[PDB]
From a paper:
One highly versatile encapsulation system has been engineered from the capsid-forming enzyme lumazine synthase from the hyperthermophilic bacterium Aquifex aeolicus. In nature, these structures encapsulate riboflavin synthase, an enzyme that converts lumazine to riboflavin. In the structures of the AaLS variants, the pentamer is the common and exclusive building block for all assemblies. Here, we elucidate the structures of the AaLS protein containers by native mass spectrometry (MS) and cryo-EM single-particle reconstruction techniques.
The best variant, AaLS-13, possesses seven additional mutations that further increase the container's net negative charge and enhance its ability to bind positively charged proteins both in vivo and in vitro. Like its evolutionary parent, AaLS-13 has a highly porous cage structure constructed exclusively from pentameric building blocks, but, in contrast to AaLS-neg, it adopts icosahedral symmetry. The 39-nm wide, ∼6-MDa large sphere is assembled from 72 pentamers (360 subunits), twice as many as AaLS-neg. The AaLS-13 cage architecture can be best viewed as an extended dodecahedron, the dual counterpart of an icosahedron, with each face consisting of a central pentamer surrounded by five others (12 × 30-mer). In contrast, the AaLS-13 assembly is not skewed, and its porous surface avoids offending contacts that could arise when a pentamer is packed inside a pseudohexagonal hole. The A118D mutation, in particular, induces a substantial displacement of the α4 helix to avoid steric and electrostatic clashes. A remarkable feature of the negatively supercharged AaLS assemblies is that roughly 30% of the protomers (48/180 for AaLS-neg and 120/360 for AaLS-13) lack inter-pentamer interactions, leaving large pores in the shell wall.
Residue numbers in the entry:
A (entry chain 0X), B (entry chain 0A), C (entry chain 0B), D (entry chain 0E), E (entry chain 0C), F (entry chain 0D): 1 to 161
Amino acid sequence: MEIYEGKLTAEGLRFGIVASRFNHALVGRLVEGAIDCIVRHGGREEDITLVCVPGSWEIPVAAGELARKEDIDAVIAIGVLIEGAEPHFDYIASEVSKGLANLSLELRKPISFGDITDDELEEAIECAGTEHGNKGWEAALSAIEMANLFKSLRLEHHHHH
Amino acid sequence: MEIYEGKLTAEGLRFGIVASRFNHALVGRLVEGAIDCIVRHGGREEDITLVCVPGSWEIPVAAGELARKEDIDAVIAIGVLIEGAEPHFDYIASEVSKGLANLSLELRKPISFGDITDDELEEAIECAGTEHGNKGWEAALSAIEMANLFKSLRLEHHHHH
Amino acid sequence: MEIYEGKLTAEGLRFGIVASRFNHALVGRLVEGAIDCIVRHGGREEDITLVCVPGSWEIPVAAGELARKEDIDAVIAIGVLIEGAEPHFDYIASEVSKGLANLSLELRKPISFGDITDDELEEAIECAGTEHGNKGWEAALSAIEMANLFKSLRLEHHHHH
Amino acid sequence: MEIYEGKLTAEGLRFGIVASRFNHALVGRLVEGAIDCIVRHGGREEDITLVCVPGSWEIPVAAGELARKEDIDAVIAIGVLIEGAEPHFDYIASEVSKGLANLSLELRKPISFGDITDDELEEAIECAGTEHGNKGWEAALSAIEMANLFKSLRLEHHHHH
Amino acid sequence: MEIYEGKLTAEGLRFGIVASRFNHALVGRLVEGAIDCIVRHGGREEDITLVCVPGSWEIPVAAGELARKEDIDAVIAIGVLIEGAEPHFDYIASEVSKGLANLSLELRKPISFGDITDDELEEAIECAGTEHGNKGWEAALSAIEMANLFKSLRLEHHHHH
Amino acid sequence: MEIYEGKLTAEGLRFGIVASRFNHALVGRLVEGAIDCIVRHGGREEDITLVCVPGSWEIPVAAGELARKEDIDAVIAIGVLIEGAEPHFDYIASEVSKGLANLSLELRKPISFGDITDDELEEAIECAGTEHGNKGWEAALSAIEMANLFKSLRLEHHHHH
């Protein structure tokens, strides 16, 4: 049987990061954690492409362009939703969840979810200190595994050629 | 500033693995943990050199050989010490720690400590089937980071020459 | 009479700093203090050599490398050990105490002990702000004196020649 | 991947047996146990080398010579530490354990602890009969295992060269 | 029989003195007593080498240089450890014992142990008056005797030569 | 089976003796104890060598000198430690204990531990008495048995050639 998955090497890969700037105290935390696991897993940072946006709403629209550049292999979602504004949390979080979903299925490119849905800002003051449970860290890793996967999937597509 | 830190790509490295066979219900579990983090951090699995021995006692006399090979860049300590005979847990666990340490200083070669000090066997059974808590995975990681750090130390020496 | 001592100038000198990343909450604070004393007490930071590692275990093996390079005059050992796991604070801390010791005596090179043994994060914060008690600050001072002292030993050796 | 472990046939091998002559009441039972499994796991007994000495103290210095012969492959250790004299029991048992440990690392030649640490004459007699626990028996077994493991080690290096 | 012991004449001998300046109120008391007995037993005070360091920790690394001079026949260990920091008194004091021990055994050059272990400062001040428990007085005298002894040992070798 | 042990005939052997002169109230007794067992076991005394030092501390460095001469076959530790100060009895007894041990493994020369570690002055009165348990008598004999043994080891090596 033929198995496919990705090792976690960030070698030869160019990454995408989008991030809100609502609640930037904790977003500072997540951006770091992602960028680390990139670079410390071999990634060079000159090809990480990073976009800020105002609020959670605009995360889709931006990622949509980011994934459409040829040279961005995977794109890392980053946004923060604490239960501040409830209609905007149920509708916008499910609409971004879905929105990202369609972007990937359509564009044929992995998009990770580094979106901290903290019911309680008390969970946010826990990781803003020093804890490594850094959702940016780990969603960044999943993006690498996908990245090397579709690098591995489509490489066996075009080298067998 | 000159900063040296370990990046986690196991690319091009040849690992040393030393294993006890006392309590192998869980040692088989740990060695898996090490090999996985190894290859799934980009290292190849043909250049892993694995050795087993009766009990934790000969762990040192083992690695003393493996580390003297020029083509093994790091040695991973593996064993399980469950509190079986207190003469053997206080004195042998202390001799493992002290013994492996002196090898490392002496050969100038990173040796990792994957020894599980569990108080009983039921904790050993729990960790081999309920969580990724896998001390082998992690001693496998620290030797990777040391492998690139020392290959960063001595190679920043050798090419700058 | 002939008396040898060392002033507190960091001029003409190249230092080593070894850093663990366990409990990094406090490590940021102490390496900061350490680099404060060097550059403020006459040193330029261009020859401060900073090597980082996982946990307290790997401290020795690193400094032993920093001491085998010709142009590192003193190495500032820095890490935090907190009473987590009694197996690891007793045996690992004395193995650091001893391991560093026999390093310097063998290599004939001063290595100082900036290892804060604390029981609470609050004991770390107290020492981080302004209480002039950053123990890395002091370890940086002691090593400066030893560096200029050994520069005073070795230079009064080669100049009288 | 390459695996090394250890088979139990003692053929082609030449052993070292070092033994105290204090408490020889139970020592007679172990010496027989040792040469029992050697001859009985295929070894001939003409190449067994038996050195007797005063008390558990002289154990190391003797083994030091036995391992320094080319045609002695493994040095099985035989001594009894019954709680007679407590300063001699803690200080000399840990110093035998340590002194042996360093001997094996230094000479890169396997050494086995066939030393029965008993608090009573009752525990000494029980296992010295036929209850599967004649510590000389397992000492000689693990020693054969490291003999074929090391001959598997260095002979897999020297023959693959 | 061939017996060797040393007289106490300080004539023709060049000494080492290492001094911690932790607790200097009594340390000055000591070195006075030291150089006193040296000079009174006929030896000139210009061949004294006196080295100053911070706290008890560096005591080793200083002497290690002092001995590697061809022209220092013996070295006088001088420092005071008062129970200030008990982790620092167990590890530093014992490490002073061992570290100095092994330097002397290694260089085959004697190092005395002018170490005052006081719990209370009053027991210090009481012992430097005229009864000459001025521990430096005695550690100085031991160094003289050992000095003449190794000059008695090796010189009964090189002149009989 | 190849067996090595030793007769007790001191014919042809040249011995080493180191003696502390602290508490000479017992040291004279033991010193003579060894000389007796030597010559009354056939050995001449023009080949015995006695060195005297201040205290228990210096016995290591001396034996290291005595064992390095070509014409000394075995060395006799001699000292009495009375519990005068717990820093000096615990540290100096274990430090000389191990210290002598490592000398022997290192110089490949047998050292007997001719120490009387008495917790009280009464135990000091028991062991230098009439019952022919004169620790010097005994450790002298252990040295002769080990002297003829390593003469049996190295002779069964050198003459078989």
